[PDB]
Design a protein around this ligand. Structure first.
Ligand SMILES: NC(=O)C1=CN([C@@H]2O[C@H](COP(=O)(O)OP(=O)(O)OC[C@H]3O[C@@H](n4cnc5c(N)ncnc54)[C@H](O)[C@@H]3O)[C@@H](O)[C@H]2O)C=CC1
Ligand SMILES: Nc1nc2c(ncn2[C@@H]2O[C@H](COP(=O)(O)OP(=O)(O)O)[C@@H](O)[C@H]2O)c(=O)[nH]1
Length: 160
């Protein structure tokens, strides 16, 4: 149902992430369900580039510090929660992700911190475009997906 890979950065769009720098000790996600990412960039950009991390070389490698205060980091955030997009003022787009691995944030840093209801999975080195299923645009006023205008990613490559 869900293959496991020894490469902890299999999903990454940025190949140069050093997992030895990750702190604290990561607990890696081992399931393969759909994850979600709000991102204001539209699909003709995201489907082409994937989700690159902001600062792989010199960003905030401590997951706890990154989660508590957004800052440039080697991580791209996603959520187990389809509906997390509703908590954004301007989500723009709810991207659907089918990618192996990632750091399970609440398993790594606990589920009592500020923001634990984001049920986050942080991808070191981001998420290459072949692991992005598609997207639904989000209507800001109603905080709902505009389901008739969802789109598939032509580069999505199923792997399980
Ligand atoms: N986005 C999500 O669905 C999730 C976010 N989080 C957390 O929620 C907070 C808000 O997250 P985001 O909006 O994702 O913050 P972010 O700072 O990663 O992205 C904000 C905006 O920056 C732009 N952007 C991001 N990465 C880029 C890149 N490499 N190149 C160019 N433009 C880029 C996009 O317009 C994006 O909407 C953060 O603390 C994040 O860790 C937690 C769970 C899921
Ligand atoms: N984990 C985490 N979440 C944050 C942080 N700042 C804001 N958020 C949450 O991320 C979601 C999006 O907030 P923000 O990035 O300000 O975008 P906006 O709602 O579109 O203006 C909201 O639920 C915020 O409460 C942060 O530093 N860390």
């Amino acid at each position: 149902a869900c293959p496991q890979f020894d490469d902890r950065t299999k999903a990454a769009a940025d190949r140069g992430v050093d997992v030895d720098r990750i702190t604290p000790e990561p607990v890696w996600r081992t399931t393969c369900g759909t994850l979600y990412r709000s991102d204001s960039r539209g699909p003709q950009v995201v489907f082409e580039e994937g989700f690159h991390a902001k600062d792989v070389q010199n960003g905030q490698y401590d997951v706890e510090k990154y989660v508590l205060v957004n800052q440039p980091s080697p991580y791209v955030s996603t959520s187990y929660d389809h509906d997390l997009y509703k908590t954004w003022y301007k989500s723009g787009y709810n991207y659907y992700v089918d990618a192996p691995g990632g750091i399970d944030v609440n398993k790594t840093i606990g589920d009592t911190h500020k923001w634990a209801d984001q049920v986050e999975v942080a991808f070191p080195g981001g998420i290459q475009r072949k692991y992005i299923i598609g997207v639904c645009p989000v209507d800001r006023q109603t905080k709902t997906e505009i389901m008739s205008d969802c789109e598939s990613n032509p580069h999505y490559q199923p792997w399980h």
